[PDB]
Enzyme design. Sequence first.
Site, PDB file in Angstrom:
ATOM      1  N   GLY A  22       0.887  -1.149   0.000  1.00  0.00           N
ATOM      2  CA  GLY A  22       0.000   0.000   0.000  1.00  0.00           C
ATOM      3  C   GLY A  22       0.916   1.187   0.000  1.00  0.00           C
ATOM      4  O   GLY A  22       1.906   1.140   0.687  1.00  0.00           O
ATOM      5  N   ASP A  23       0.576   2.231  -0.761  1.00  0.00           N
ATOM      6  CA  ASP A  23       1.443   3.402  -0.931  1.00  0.00           C
ATOM      7  C   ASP A  23       1.923   3.987   0.403  1.00  0.00           C
ATOM      8  O   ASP A  23       3.131   4.146   0.616  1.00  0.00           O
ATOM      9  CB  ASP A  23       0.751   4.457  -1.833  1.00  0.00           C
ATOM     10  CG  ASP A  23      -0.461   5.143  -1.173  1.00  0.00           C
ATOM     11  OD1 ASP A  23      -1.212   4.529  -0.366  1.00  0.00           O
ATOM     12  OD2 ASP A  23      -0.655   6.338  -1.489  1.00  0.00           O
ATOM     13  N   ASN A 155      -0.509  11.381  -4.584  1.00  0.00           N
ATOM     14  CA  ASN A 155      -0.675  10.072  -5.298  1.00  0.00           C
ATOM     15  C   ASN A 155      -2.093   9.914  -5.853  1.00  0.00           C
ATOM     16  O   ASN A 155      -3.039   9.668  -5.096  1.00  0.00           O
ATOM     17  CB  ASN A 155      -0.302   8.878  -4.383  1.00  0.00           C
ATOM     18  CG  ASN A 155      -0.068   7.545  -5.172  1.00  0.00           C
ATOM     19  OD1 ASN A 155       0.051   7.546  -6.404  1.00  0.00           O
ATOM     20  ND2 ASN A 155       0.030   6.442  -4.457  1.00  0.00           N
ATOM     21  N   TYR A 156      -2.243  10.043  -7.180  1.00  0.00           N
ATOM     22  CA  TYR A 156      -3.560  10.152  -7.813  1.00  0.00           C
ATOM     23  C   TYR A 156      -3.994   8.876  -8.568  1.00  0.00           C
ATOM     24  O   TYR A 156      -3.330   8.466  -9.530  1.00  0.00           O
ATOM     25  CB  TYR A 156      -3.559  11.365  -8.762  1.00  0.00           C
ATOM     26  CG  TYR A 156      -4.828  11.571  -9.564  1.00  0.00           C
ATOM     27  CD1 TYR A 156      -6.082  11.451  -8.971  1.00  0.00           C
ATOM     28  CD2 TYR A 156      -4.770  11.927 -10.915  1.00  0.00           C
ATOM     29  CE1 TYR A 156      -7.255  11.665  -9.712  1.00  0.00           C
ATOM     30  CE2 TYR A 156      -5.939  12.146 -11.657  1.00  0.00           C
ATOM     31  CZ  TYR A 156      -7.163  12.012 -11.049  1.00  0.00           C
ATOM     32  OH  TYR A 156      -8.330  12.223 -11.766  1.00  0.00           O
ATOM     33  N   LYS A 215       7.964  16.115  -7.362  1.00  0.00           N
ATOM     34  CA  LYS A 215       8.711  14.931  -7.756  1.00  0.00           C
ATOM     35  C   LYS A 215       8.457  14.786  -9.259  1.00  0.00           C
ATOM     36  O   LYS A 215       7.291  14.868  -9.720  1.00  0.00           O
ATOM     37  CB  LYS A 215       8.169  13.692  -7.031  1.00  0.00           C
ATOM     38  CG  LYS A 215       8.416  13.688  -5.482  1.00  0.00           C
ATOM     39  CD  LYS A 215       7.924  12.345  -4.841  1.00  0.00           C
ATOM     40  CE  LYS A 215       6.540  12.454  -4.336  1.00  0.00           C
ATOM     41  NZ  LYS A 215       5.969  11.155  -3.897  1.00  0.00           N
ATOM     42  N   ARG A 216       9.523  14.583 -10.013  1.00  0.00           N
ATOM     43  CA  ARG A 216       9.408  14.689 -11.471  1.00  0.00           C
ATOM     44  C   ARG A 216      10.061  13.495 -12.146  1.00  0.00           C
ATOM     45  O   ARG A 216      10.662  13.624 -13.224  1.00  0.00           O
ATOM     46  CB  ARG A 216      10.032  15.975 -11.970  1.00  0.00           C
ATOM     47  CG  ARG A 216       9.475  17.241 -11.379  1.00  0.00           C
ATOM     48  CD  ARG A 216       9.797  18.430 -12.272  1.00  0.00           C
ATOM     49  NE  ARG A 216      11.225  18.801 -12.231  1.00  0.00           N
ATOM     50  CZ  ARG A 216      11.746  19.786 -12.943  1.00  0.00           C
ATOM     51  NH1 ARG A 216      10.966  20.492 -13.770  1.00  0.00           N
ATOM     52  NH2 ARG A 216      13.039  20.070 -12.839  1.00  0.00           N
ATOM     53  N   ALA A 218      12.531  11.129 -13.405  1.00  0.00           N
ATOM     54  CA  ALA A 218      13.962  11.217 -13.692  1.00  0.00           C
ATOM     55  C   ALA A 218      14.439  12.655 -13.795  1.00  0.00           C
ATOM     56  O   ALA A 218      15.648  12.914 -13.722  1.00  0.00           O
ATOM     57  CB  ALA A 218      14.333  10.405 -14.997  1.00  0.00           C
ATOM     58  N   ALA A 248       6.913   1.874  -6.328  1.00  0.00           N
ATOM     59  CA  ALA A 248       7.255   2.499  -5.053  1.00  0.00           C
ATOM     60  C   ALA A 248       8.350   3.545  -5.121  1.00  0.00           C
ATOM     61  O   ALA A 248       8.874   3.946  -4.056  1.00  0.00           O
ATOM     62  CB  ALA A 248       7.620   1.424  -3.991  1.00  0.00           C
ATOM     63  N   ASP A 251       6.738   6.643  -3.544  1.00  0.00           N
ATOM     64  CA  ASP A 251       6.477   6.457  -2.097  1.00  0.00           C
ATOM     65  C   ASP A 251       7.769   6.413  -1.255  1.00  0.00           C
ATOM     66  O   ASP A 251       7.842   6.912  -0.087  1.00  0.00           O
ATOM     67  CB  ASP A 251       5.653   5.205  -1.819  1.00  0.00           C
ATOM     68  CG  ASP A 251       4.423   5.073  -2.737  1.00  0.00           C
ATOM     69  OD1 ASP A 251       3.831   6.085  -3.137  1.00  0.00           O
ATOM     70  OD2 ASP A 251       4.087   3.921  -3.049  1.00  0.00           O
TER      71      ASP A 251
END
Lengths: 295, 300
Positions: A22-23, A155-156, A215-216, A218, A248, A251
């Site tokens: 789970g995330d 987290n979508y 967060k992008r 790479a 993950a 996460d």
Amino acid sequence: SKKIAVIGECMIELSVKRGFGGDTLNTSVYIARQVDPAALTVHYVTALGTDSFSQQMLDAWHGENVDTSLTQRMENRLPGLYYIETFYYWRNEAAAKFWLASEQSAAICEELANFDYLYLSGISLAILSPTSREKLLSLLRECRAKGGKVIFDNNYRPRLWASKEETQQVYQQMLECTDIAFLTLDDEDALWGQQPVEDVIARTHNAGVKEVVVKRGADSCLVSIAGEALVDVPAVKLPKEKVIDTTAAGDSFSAGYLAVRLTGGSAENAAKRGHLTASTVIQYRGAIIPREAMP
Amino acid sequence: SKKIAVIGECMIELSEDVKRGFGGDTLNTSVYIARQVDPAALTVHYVTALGTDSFSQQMLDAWHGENVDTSLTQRMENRLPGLYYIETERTFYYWRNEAAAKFWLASEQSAAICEELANFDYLYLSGISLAILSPTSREKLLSLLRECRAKGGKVIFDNNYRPRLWASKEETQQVYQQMLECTDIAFLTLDDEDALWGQQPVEDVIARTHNAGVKEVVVKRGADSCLVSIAGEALVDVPAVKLPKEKVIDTTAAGDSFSAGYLAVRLTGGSAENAAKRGHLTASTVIQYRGAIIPREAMP
């Protein structure tokens, strides 16, 4: 010592092998693996059943030094279950959906209002009823009123929501209760339409969020602290053959970032740790990589 | 040839080494009938609903491989099969409450599939087939059964009782009463009748079921003999051939395979007594193997 509670769901995972995943639980484990518990303890907050899958989960989490004393066990519920080939979910009756709608919810929320940090993801909100989402938002407000900080990971997962408009309204309420937001840029693209990163950052500060961490994948991590210059930290380029499983990555990045940020480290060092963590994780199969038993 | 449609649910099965398959009471029965009848005499049609996923696909191909026709089974975009988990002494765990199979009578193909089914020679379902349907869906099903019988079709019911699937014992009682008023052949597992209605002598179980209108009552008594009561005729009483107990590996599917063996004979011109013998032979073989669906080669 300080305390963080991570709120959400962990399911039974099938891939044929059986584990759990789970995330938010992934994130909780990576935090616990990296911090001195004298500085910060990690609590997972969810609900499970009184079955043996739930037990095996609780046991493994305790082995990761994750405190489950605020997780509830519900006799007539099972965990949710997911299967990896493509993902398939049997999660719409999970115990985890109901943690805010039991006779114990109230005492748990009074305990959480006093926590130093509360963390949750877009998934954690998705799985709750509109009424449970309201109760959770009120807990967050009370925690912040008492000096606690609220961290959100965006987290979508569109399949978990009734519509794009519902997610937008709920994310908007959430961002107005948030101190640190982790935004995966692709997820902001998907949810709000594609927009320059500067506008993603700006609108998130406008909601009231002080620290926005973008967060992008790479591409580099951007940290924006309201009233400060942008922090831009490049990722840890690996050769392609070392990348085995990108599950993950996101996460575990949030985990590494908080392991440093919540124990006194700079935003630049927190980003470095998020990148280092995500880089390690993607070199091993599975969300949760083998624990470093002997560092 | 004659057509039997078998209506209910087949789920994704996990058993724990961990293996993936599929299982469901009425599907197991369909496979066992299909394994033993002449396709020229009787064709077997499984009527359910599944997803568009690859789990639903692996099921459809597997059933096609058993000569079960799936033309009346629906594929539903936004649903998955139910799923269950066996841990091995066995424990069973279910994730079945949104399965596609629950909704086969609440769709746009529903009325048209029912129109095809109204014309079938035999329709078969179990108590599980009824449990998973909403009251409104149960009513449409009962309506289909009446139409089928008015057309000269025969309705076959297996009383397989799983109390966890029902809102209350009262609800099961009401829906069974309605079903049995619409039934031509009833397979009654005697332990199920005892659990649902309270322990009563088998002769009374037989009488009350005839009283509800059922012509042929087939009572499954596990290791004890099968009793077949046809209204107006003397009882038929058929023992199993005794099996050394160490050969009994898995009683899973015993009752569902017995019904299949019975029907493979009864629906192709055989006597009640030979139908019972074949029920017993099929069940005997089945319980000697792990898993609901034994290998083709293992068959009687």
